[PDB]
Tab-separated table of C-alpha atoms and ligand atoms in Angstrom:
chain	number	residue	atom	x	y	z
A	1	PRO	CA	2.127	-138.970	-52.632
A	2	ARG	CA	4.364	-139.562	-48.773
A	3	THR	CA	3.016	-136.084	-48.050
A	4	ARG	CA	-0.270	-137.796	-48.256
A	5	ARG	CA	0.412	-140.136	-45.367
A	6	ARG	CA	2.172	-137.409	-43.181
A	7	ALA	CA	-0.993	-135.735	-43.596
A	8	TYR	CA	-3.276	-138.585	-42.492
A	9	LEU	CA	-0.834	-139.032	-39.520
A	10	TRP	CA	-1.192	-135.220	-38.602
A	11	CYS	CA	-4.987	-135.807	-38.549
A	12	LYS	CA	-5.069	-138.773	-36.933
A	13	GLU	CA	-2.920	-137.833	-34.223
A	14	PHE	CA	-4.390	-134.363	-33.347
A	15	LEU	CA	-7.906	-134.737	-33.992
A	16	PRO	CA	-10.698	-136.390	-31.825
A	17	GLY	CA	-13.107	-138.863	-31.825
A	18	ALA	CA	-13.778	-140.364	-35.340
A	19	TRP	CA	-10.483	-139.282	-36.596
A	20	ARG	CA	-8.426	-141.159	-34.027
A	21	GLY	CA	-8.782	-144.541	-35.015
A	22	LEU	CA	-9.133	-144.369	-38.729
A	23	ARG	CA	-7.084	-145.952	-41.439
A	24	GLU	CA	-4.878	-144.272	-44.223
A	25	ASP	CA	-7.515	-146.021	-46.998
A	26	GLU	CA	-10.209	-143.836	-45.550
A	27	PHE	CA	-8.565	-140.346	-45.476
A	28	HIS	CA	-9.664	-137.861	-48.019
A	29	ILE	CA	-7.323	-135.121	-48.520
A	30	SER	CA	-7.589	-132.464	-51.578
A	31	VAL	CA	-5.290	-129.487	-52.723
A	32	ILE	CA	-7.029	-125.970	-52.069
A	33	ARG	CA	-4.025	-123.977	-52.993
A	34	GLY	CA	-0.850	-125.616	-54.204
A	35	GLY	CA	3.123	-124.095	-54.384
A	36	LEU	CA	6.210	-123.972	-52.406
A	37	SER	CA	5.165	-121.885	-49.248
A	38	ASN	CA	1.609	-121.574	-47.245
A	39	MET	CA	0.053	-124.867	-49.230
A	40	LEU	CA	-3.467	-125.054	-48.222
A	41	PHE	CA	-5.620	-128.468	-48.164
A	42	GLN	CA	-9.005	-129.873	-47.185
A	43	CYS	CA	-8.864	-132.765	-45.231
A	44	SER	CA	-12.240	-134.955	-44.073
A	45	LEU	CA	-13.735	-138.016	-42.889
A	46	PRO	CA	-15.471	-140.715	-44.968
A	47	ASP	CA	-19.156	-139.058	-45.974
A	48	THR	CA	-20.078	-142.688	-44.466
A	49	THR	CA	-17.942	-142.317	-40.963
A	50	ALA	CA	-20.061	-140.556	-37.905
A	51	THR	CA	-18.935	-138.377	-35.671
A	52	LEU	CA	-18.244	-139.437	-32.009
A	53	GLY	CA	-18.586	-136.294	-30.111
A	54	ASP	CA	-17.898	-132.578	-31.409
A	55	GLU	CA	-14.808	-133.759	-33.661
A	56	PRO	CA	-15.384	-131.522	-37.081
A	57	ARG	CA	-15.579	-133.290	-40.336
A	58	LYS	CA	-13.884	-131.492	-42.377
A	59	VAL	CA	-10.622	-129.334	-41.498
A	60	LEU	CA	-7.994	-127.668	-43.743
A	61	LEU	CA	-4.208	-128.137	-43.251
A	62	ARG	CA	-1.823	-125.343	-43.601
A	63	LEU	CA	1.892	-126.317	-44.677
A	64	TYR	CA	4.703	-123.727	-44.128
A	65	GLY	CA	6.542	-125.178	-47.020
A	66	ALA	CA	10.355	-122.423	-47.111
A	67	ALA	CA	8.428	-115.228	-36.564
A	68	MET	CA	7.023	-118.631	-36.631
A	69	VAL	CA	6.143	-118.268	-32.787
A	70	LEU	CA	4.804	-114.862	-33.422
A	71	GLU	CA	2.346	-115.982	-36.038
A	72	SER	CA	1.379	-119.159	-34.358
A	73	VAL	CA	0.594	-117.314	-30.886
A	74	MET	CA	-1.424	-114.563	-32.946
A	75	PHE	CA	-3.302	-117.301	-34.843
A	76	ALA	CA	-4.128	-119.763	-31.481
A	77	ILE	CA	-5.264	-116.188	-29.826
A	78	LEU	CA	-7.726	-114.816	-32.410
A	79	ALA	CA	-9.175	-118.578	-32.407
A	80	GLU	CA	-9.605	-118.365	-28.423
A	81	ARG	CA	-11.496	-114.713	-29.158
A	82	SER	CA	-13.648	-116.086	-32.034
A	83	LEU	CA	-12.367	-113.685	-34.373
A	84	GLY	CA	-10.716	-116.669	-36.312
A	85	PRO	CA	-10.935	-120.193	-37.492
A	86	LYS	CA	-10.222	-122.511	-34.164
A	87	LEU	CA	-6.507	-123.974	-33.808
A	88	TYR	CA	-7.121	-128.040	-34.126
A	89	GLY	CA	-3.136	-128.760	-34.146
A	90	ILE	CA	0.190	-127.155	-34.295
A	91	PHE	CA	3.483	-128.986	-35.435
A	92	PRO	CA	6.838	-127.937	-37.102
A	93	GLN	CA	5.455	-128.041	-40.560
A	94	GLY	CA	2.011	-126.350	-40.387
A	95	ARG	CA	-1.193	-126.359	-38.704
A	96	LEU	CA	-4.634	-128.107	-38.769
A	97	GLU	CA	-7.295	-124.900	-38.713
A	98	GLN	CA	-11.184	-125.126	-38.654
A	99	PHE	CA	-13.012	-125.165	-41.999
A	100	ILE	CA	-15.141	-122.464	-42.378
A	101	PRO	CA	-17.953	-123.104	-45.386
A	102	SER	CA	-17.810	-119.755	-47.073
A	103	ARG	CA	-15.745	-118.363	-49.977
A	104	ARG	CA	-13.873	-115.101	-50.805
A	105	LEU	CA	-15.126	-111.845	-51.464
A	106	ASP	CA	-14.634	-110.563	-55.104
A	107	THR	CA	-13.246	-107.451	-55.646
A	108	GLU	CA	-16.208	-105.707	-56.616
A	109	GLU	CA	-18.104	-106.866	-53.723
A	110	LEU	CA	-15.477	-104.510	-51.310
A	111	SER	CA	-17.940	-101.716	-52.911
A	112	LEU	CA	-21.201	-102.917	-51.463
A	113	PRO	CA	-22.623	-100.737	-49.157
A	114	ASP	CA	-23.231	-103.762	-46.189
A	115	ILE	CA	-20.047	-105.565	-47.117
A	116	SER	CA	-18.181	-102.110	-46.736
A	117	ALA	CA	-19.761	-101.491	-43.406
A	118	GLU	CA	-19.025	-104.638	-42.031
A	119	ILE	CA	-15.411	-104.960	-43.122
A	120	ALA	CA	-15.431	-101.466	-41.041
A	121	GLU	CA	-16.511	-102.844	-38.370
A	122	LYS	CA	-14.509	-105.776	-38.229
A	123	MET	CA	-11.163	-103.806	-38.857
A	124	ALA	CA	-12.354	-101.642	-35.932
A	125	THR	CA	-12.792	-104.348	-33.776
A	126	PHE	CA	-9.389	-105.958	-34.452
A	127	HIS	CA	-7.680	-102.412	-34.228
A	128	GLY	CA	-8.989	-102.528	-30.689
A	129	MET	CA	-7.910	-105.341	-29.243
A	130	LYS	CA	-4.652	-105.738	-27.271
A	131	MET	CA	-2.106	-108.600	-28.521
A	132	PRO	CA	1.545	-109.388	-26.921
A	133	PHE	CA	3.819	-107.429	-29.536
A	134	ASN	CA	5.791	-104.793	-29.965
A	135	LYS	CA	3.469	-101.204	-29.551
A	136	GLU	CA	5.873	-98.999	-31.223
A	137	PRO	CA	4.808	-98.308	-34.908
A	138	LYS	CA	8.164	-99.410	-36.832
A	139	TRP	CA	6.696	-101.756	-39.493
A	140	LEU	CA	5.708	-99.453	-41.607
A	141	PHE	CA	8.892	-97.439	-42.523
A	142	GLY	CA	11.051	-100.549	-41.254
A	143	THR	CA	9.643	-102.954	-43.490
A	144	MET	CA	9.470	-100.063	-46.502
A	145	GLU	CA	13.424	-99.697	-45.493
A	146	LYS	CA	14.159	-103.188	-45.824
A	147	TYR	CA	12.609	-104.042	-49.323
A	148	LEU	CA	14.088	-101.191	-50.334
A	149	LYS	CA	17.487	-102.288	-49.334
A	150	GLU	CA	16.445	-106.006	-51.269
A	151	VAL	CA	15.421	-103.867	-54.445
A	152	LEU	CA	18.531	-101.297	-54.925
A	153	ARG	CA	20.341	-105.129	-54.552
A	154	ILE	CA	18.540	-107.128	-57.343
A	155	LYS	CA	19.835	-108.361	-60.312
A	156	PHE	CA	17.766	-109.364	-63.103
A	157	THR	CA	19.394	-112.052	-65.872
A	158	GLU	CA	16.564	-111.562	-68.209
A	159	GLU	CA	16.698	-108.189	-70.297
A	160	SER	CA	12.950	-107.624	-70.023
A	161	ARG	CA	13.147	-107.275	-66.413
A	162	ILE	CA	16.206	-105.388	-66.373
A	163	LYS	CA	14.197	-102.726	-68.171
A	164	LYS	CA	11.635	-103.109	-66.056
A	165	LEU	CA	13.440	-102.559	-62.943
A	166	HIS	CA	15.347	-99.479	-64.503
A	167	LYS	CA	12.709	-97.464	-64.814
A	168	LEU	CA	11.302	-98.328	-61.813
A	169	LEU	CA	14.849	-97.154	-59.695
A	170	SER	CA	14.439	-94.007	-62.421
A	171	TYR	CA	12.090	-92.742	-59.755
A	172	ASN	CA	14.992	-92.212	-57.224
A	173	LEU	CA	12.827	-94.644	-54.733
A	174	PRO	CA	15.003	-93.449	-51.969
A	175	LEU	CA	14.639	-90.163	-52.038
A	176	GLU	CA	10.963	-90.242	-52.688
A	177	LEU	CA	10.719	-92.838	-49.619
A	178	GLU	CA	12.015	-89.444	-48.056
A	179	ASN	CA	9.334	-87.529	-49.491
A	180	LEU	CA	6.688	-90.077	-47.730
A	181	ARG	CA	8.565	-89.868	-44.556
A	182	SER	CA	8.012	-86.017	-44.248
A	183	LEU	CA	4.813	-86.334	-45.520
A	184	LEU	CA	3.564	-89.286	-43.433
A	185	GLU	CA	5.382	-87.773	-40.024
A	186	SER	CA	3.135	-84.902	-40.320
A	187	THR	CA	0.157	-86.658	-40.370
A	188	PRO	CA	-1.072	-87.929	-37.120
A	189	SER	CA	-2.801	-91.646	-36.916
A	190	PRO	CA	-3.422	-93.472	-34.016
A	191	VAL	CA	-1.014	-96.723	-33.511
A	192	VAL	CA	-3.072	-99.755	-33.322
A	193	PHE	CA	-3.153	-103.611	-33.941
A	194	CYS	CA	-3.503	-103.797	-37.998
A	195	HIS	CA	-4.148	-106.608	-40.218
A	196	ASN	CA	-2.106	-104.781	-42.925
A	197	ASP	CA	-3.358	-106.914	-45.989
A	198	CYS	CA	-7.123	-106.424	-45.764
A	199	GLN	CA	-7.944	-107.310	-49.431
A	200	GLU	CA	-10.824	-109.352	-51.014
A	201	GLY	CA	-8.707	-112.429	-50.617
A	202	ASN	CA	-8.243	-112.380	-46.692
A	203	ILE	CA	-12.286	-111.888	-46.424
A	204	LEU	CA	-14.378	-115.036	-46.349
A	205	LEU	CA	-18.113	-114.661	-47.059
A	206	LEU	CA	-19.645	-117.094	-44.131
A	207	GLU	CA	-22.253	-119.678	-45.982
A	208	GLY	CA	-25.622	-119.243	-44.645
A	209	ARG	CA	-24.868	-116.087	-43.547
A	210	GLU	CA	-25.427	-114.364	-46.894
A	211	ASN	CA	-28.770	-113.183	-45.836
A	212	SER	CA	-27.223	-111.296	-42.248
A	213	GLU	CA	-26.769	-107.631	-42.855
A	214	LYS	CA	-23.748	-106.934	-40.218
A	215	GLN	CA	-22.628	-110.557	-39.670
A	216	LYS	CA	-21.541	-112.417	-42.837
A	217	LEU	CA	-18.017	-111.932	-43.016
A	218	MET	CA	-14.331	-113.480	-41.419
A	219	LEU	CA	-11.012	-111.398	-41.793
A	220	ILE	CA	-8.473	-114.077	-42.254
A	221	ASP	CA	-4.757	-114.062	-42.769
A	222	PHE	CA	-2.950	-112.413	-40.519
A	223	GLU	CA	0.190	-113.082	-41.507
A	224	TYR	CA	1.429	-109.221	-41.982
A	225	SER	CA	-0.268	-108.375	-39.048
A	226	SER	CA	1.581	-105.758	-36.614
A	227	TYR	CA	0.886	-102.852	-34.399
A	228	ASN	CA	1.311	-100.215	-37.195
A	229	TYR	CA	-0.766	-96.759	-38.277
A	230	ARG	CA	-4.580	-97.236	-38.584
A	231	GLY	CA	-3.974	-94.932	-41.791
A	232	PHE	CA	-1.980	-97.680	-43.397
A	233	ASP	CA	-4.998	-99.957	-42.666
A	234	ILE	CA	-8.104	-98.416	-44.075
A	235	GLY	CA	-5.665	-96.587	-46.586
A	236	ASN	CA	-4.344	-100.038	-47.939
A	237	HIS	CA	-7.793	-101.437	-47.853
A	238	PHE	CA	-8.863	-98.715	-49.895
A	239	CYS	CA	-6.347	-99.124	-52.382
A	240	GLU	CA	-7.299	-102.939	-52.685
A	241	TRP	CA	-10.343	-101.555	-54.513
A	242	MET	CA	-8.592	-100.961	-57.547
A	243	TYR	CA	-7.042	-104.294	-57.415
A	244	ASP	CA	-8.496	-107.750	-58.953
A	245	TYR	CA	-6.402	-110.623	-58.802
A	246	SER	CA	-8.564	-113.541	-60.122
A	247	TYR	CA	-7.381	-112.390	-63.695
A	248	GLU	CA	-6.928	-115.762	-65.271
A	249	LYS	CA	-4.462	-114.345	-67.823
A	250	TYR	CA	-1.040	-112.989	-67.895
A	251	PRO	CA	0.092	-110.632	-65.927
A	252	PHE	CA	-2.592	-112.151	-63.581
A	253	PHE	CA	-4.110	-109.093	-62.031
A	254	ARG	CA	-6.170	-106.060	-63.421
A	255	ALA	CA	-5.709	-102.535	-61.886
A	256	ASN	CA	-8.615	-100.127	-62.160
A	257	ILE	CA	-7.662	-96.796	-60.808
A	258	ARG	CA	-11.054	-95.518	-61.315
A	259	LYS	CA	-12.436	-98.201	-58.837
A	260	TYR	CA	-10.992	-96.375	-55.763
A	261	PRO	CA	-13.645	-95.363	-53.432
A	262	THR	CA	-15.473	-91.749	-53.663
A	263	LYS	CA	-15.523	-89.564	-51.322
A	264	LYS	CA	-19.190	-90.755	-50.512
A	265	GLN	CA	-17.886	-94.402	-50.112
A	266	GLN	CA	-15.187	-93.441	-48.364
A	267	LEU	CA	-17.497	-91.512	-45.937
A	268	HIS	CA	-19.658	-94.612	-45.766
A	269	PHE	CA	-16.572	-96.490	-44.525
A	270	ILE	CA	-15.418	-94.292	-42.133
A	271	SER	CA	-19.083	-93.881	-40.780
A	272	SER	CA	-19.218	-97.698	-40.132
A	273	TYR	CA	-15.448	-97.925	-38.587
A	274	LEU	CA	-15.546	-94.936	-36.245
A	275	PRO	CA	-18.514	-95.932	-33.727
A	276	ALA	CA	-17.200	-99.155	-33.557
A	277	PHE	CA	-13.998	-98.088	-32.601
A	278	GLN	CA	-14.331	-94.900	-30.488
A	279	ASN	CA	-17.300	-95.808	-28.142
A	280	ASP	CA	-17.840	-91.851	-27.135
A	281	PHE	CA	-18.123	-91.670	-31.174
A	282	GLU	CA	-21.928	-91.604	-31.308
A	283	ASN	CA	-22.239	-88.999	-28.498
A	284	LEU	CA	-20.341	-86.468	-30.173
A	285	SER	CA	-21.990	-83.671	-31.642
A	286	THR	CA	-22.600	-83.436	-35.828
A	287	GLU	CA	-19.766	-80.858	-36.068
A	288	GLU	CA	-17.150	-82.382	-33.873
A	289	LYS	CA	-18.139	-85.863	-36.019
A	290	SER	CA	-17.474	-83.949	-39.306
A	291	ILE	CA	-14.679	-82.724	-38.414
A	292	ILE	CA	-13.299	-86.037	-37.419
A	293	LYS	CA	-14.071	-87.584	-40.588
A	294	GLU	CA	-12.901	-84.935	-42.691
A	295	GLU	CA	-9.675	-85.418	-40.753
A	296	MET	CA	-9.682	-89.119	-41.187
A	297	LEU	CA	-9.761	-88.798	-44.938
A	298	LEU	CA	-6.979	-86.927	-44.982
A	299	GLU	CA	-5.116	-89.578	-42.883
A	300	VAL	CA	-6.051	-92.375	-44.706
A	301	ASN	CA	-5.713	-91.108	-48.106
A	302	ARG	CA	-2.260	-89.780	-47.200
A	303	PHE	CA	-1.576	-93.159	-45.823
A	304	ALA	CA	-2.670	-94.672	-48.880
A	305	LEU	CA	0.362	-93.627	-50.681
A	306	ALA	CA	2.256	-95.901	-48.465
A	307	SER	CA	0.294	-98.927	-49.518
A	308	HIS	CA	1.414	-98.309	-52.912
A	309	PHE	CA	4.979	-97.963	-52.214
A	310	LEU	CA	5.184	-100.709	-49.690
A	311	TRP	CA	3.343	-102.991	-52.294
A	312	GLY	CA	5.382	-102.048	-54.825
A	313	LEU	CA	8.894	-102.684	-53.609
A	314	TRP	CA	7.602	-105.787	-52.200
A	315	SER	CA	6.259	-106.881	-55.664
A	316	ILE	CA	9.532	-106.227	-57.127
A	317	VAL	CA	11.711	-108.566	-54.339
A	318	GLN	CA	8.835	-110.899	-55.245
A	319	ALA	CA	9.812	-111.025	-58.950
A	320	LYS	CA	13.166	-111.976	-58.118
A	321	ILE	CA	12.554	-114.404	-55.242
A	322	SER	CA	8.995	-116.024	-55.314
A	323	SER	CA	7.590	-119.003	-57.197
A	324	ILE	CA	4.221	-118.180	-57.697
A	325	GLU	CA	2.776	-117.598	-61.342
A	326	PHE	CA	2.242	-113.759	-61.192
A	327	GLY	CA	3.039	-110.456	-63.067
A	328	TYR	CA	5.367	-108.875	-60.323
A	329	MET	CA	7.296	-106.492	-62.278
A	330	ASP	CA	3.931	-105.409	-63.930
A	331	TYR	CA	2.203	-105.080	-60.668
A	332	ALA	CA	4.962	-102.938	-58.892
A	333	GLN	CA	4.640	-100.595	-61.698
A	334	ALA	CA	0.821	-100.693	-61.598
A	335	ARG	CA	1.355	-99.395	-57.608
A	336	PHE	CA	3.780	-96.771	-58.681
A	337	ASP	CA	1.728	-95.300	-61.073
A	338	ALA	CA	-1.129	-95.116	-58.971
A	339	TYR	CA	1.372	-93.405	-55.923
A	340	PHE	CA	1.987	-90.812	-58.659
A	341	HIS	CA	-1.626	-90.743	-59.124
A	342	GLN	CA	-2.335	-90.052	-55.905
A	343	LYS	CA	-0.298	-87.817	-55.207
A	344	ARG	CA	-0.867	-85.794	-58.160
A	345	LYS	CA	-4.928	-85.907	-56.599
A	346	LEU	CA	-3.898	-85.005	-52.983
A	347	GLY	CA	-1.421	-82.094	-53.984
A	348	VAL	CA	1.664	-83.645	-52.123
B	1	U6H	C1	-5.386	-121.005	-55.464
B	1	U6H	O1	-6.534	-121.104	-55.104
B	1	U6H	C2	-7.005	-120.629	-53.705
B	1	U6H	C3	-5.975	-119.646	-53.234
B	1	U6H	C4	-6.564	-119.311	-51.842
B	1	U6H	C5	-7.810	-119.704	-51.011
B	1	U6H	C6	-8.289	-120.432	-51.944
B	1	U6H	N1	-9.688	-120.819	-51.869
B	1	U6H	C7	-10.587	-120.594	-50.922
B	1	U6H	O2	-10.373	-119.513	-49.921
B	1	U6H	C8	-12.051	-121.413	-50.583
B	1	U6H	C9	-12.952	-120.721	-49.661
B	1	U6H	C10	-12.418	-120.137	-48.056
B	1	U6H	C11	-12.244	-121.998	-47.469
B	1	U6H	N2	-11.445	-121.906	-46.016
B	1	U6H	C12	-12.411	-122.242	-45.153
B	1	U6H	N3	-11.606	-122.150	-44.064
B	1	U6H	C13	-10.905	-122.089	-44.152
B	1	U6H	C14	-9.499	-121.067	-43.906
B	1	U6H	N4	-9.713	-121.813	-42.416
B	1	U6H	N5	-8.711	-120.499	-43.956
B	1	U6H	C15	-8.861	-120.376	-45.728
B	1	U6H	C16	-7.546	-119.465	-46.091
B	1	U6H	C17	-6.334	-119.486	-45.413
B	1	U6H	C18	-5.713	-118.491	-45.652
B	1	U6H	N6	-5.705	-117.975	-47.219
B	1	U6H	C19	-6.940	-117.851	-47.925
B	1	U6H	C20	-7.959	-118.822	-47.185
B	1	U6H	N7	-9.787	-120.900	-46.183
B	1	U6H	C21	-10.903	-121.461	-45.989
B	1	U6H	C22	-10.905	-122.736	-48.305
B	1	U6H	C23	-11.856	-123.034	-49.951
B	1	U6H	C24	-8.300	-121.056	-53.111
B	2	MG	MG1	-3.782	-114.053	-47.948
């Protein structure tokens, strides 16, 4: 399109070497993810054109479509620190990032011992770093209260969605949030820099590193990241073991309660997290380690309720406003079913 030109100009003007002197009739762009927001494209030199210096042959273009300062600063910082794709270009419409040869993980891979251990280690790393953002943990209850406010105001026109929403509203979401509030306020959890969306779709498996045991993954997509309770980040990740967003028919996901990590799988994950986060931890006694882990299991199982609640509310608002083809109302109902299931399991 016209879009094609613009993208050519971005690459020509922002990228070094071969790119600088490149013609419009040599530009290779393809869609990776279309839509109206956060569109993703692959852009590349002709296979035929040689590279002057260090310039990449392929880049990823992200377009904002339809807090900008914050996300940009964070992405740049993560690039500088080698915990994210390099930033090659930034502009009002979007950015040019490094193209990492890789694929996203699938849902079932989250439970593989070595994958899970590395995710825990990466999360521990992310959690231990300093970022120029507000350190007060207002994000969790702030976001829930914001989405709850939207939810309570939403009017659907179509009858199907009116009834689905009516069933969700019948839980008494305001009162249930206060129930969650008293539970979580009685559960100490350290405030750390949280990814807040640590799912398979945000975890790259690096090409050529598949044989590495401990270093084959990169966490990406920090758009929800904030200082938050560590319980949320781990609990949210555990919840993600149940949800597979690759299903190709309506509602475009599958939920499987049975796939929530067992006590053993949770212990495996936190056994890998804790030494990467707490430098002393390795040197503690067996009983002290055991005490910490048992406490941490209670912590993250309770914060998993907020994952269900927050993303359930979020998903209701998305049904009203999103352009993505996804069964948002059914996903909201699946999160709320898991919320009540997890409360029954915990006895809270
Ligand atoms: C609707 O189809 C989709 C939706 C999202 C992502 C994808 N495809 C991929 O993620 C593939 C594996 C990773 C590939 N990749 C190489 N470098 C990448 C980069 N820097 N970012 C992302 C990326 C960014 C935000 N969300 C998902 C992936 N992806 C990068 C792109 C192709 C396909
Ligand atoms: Mg994402």
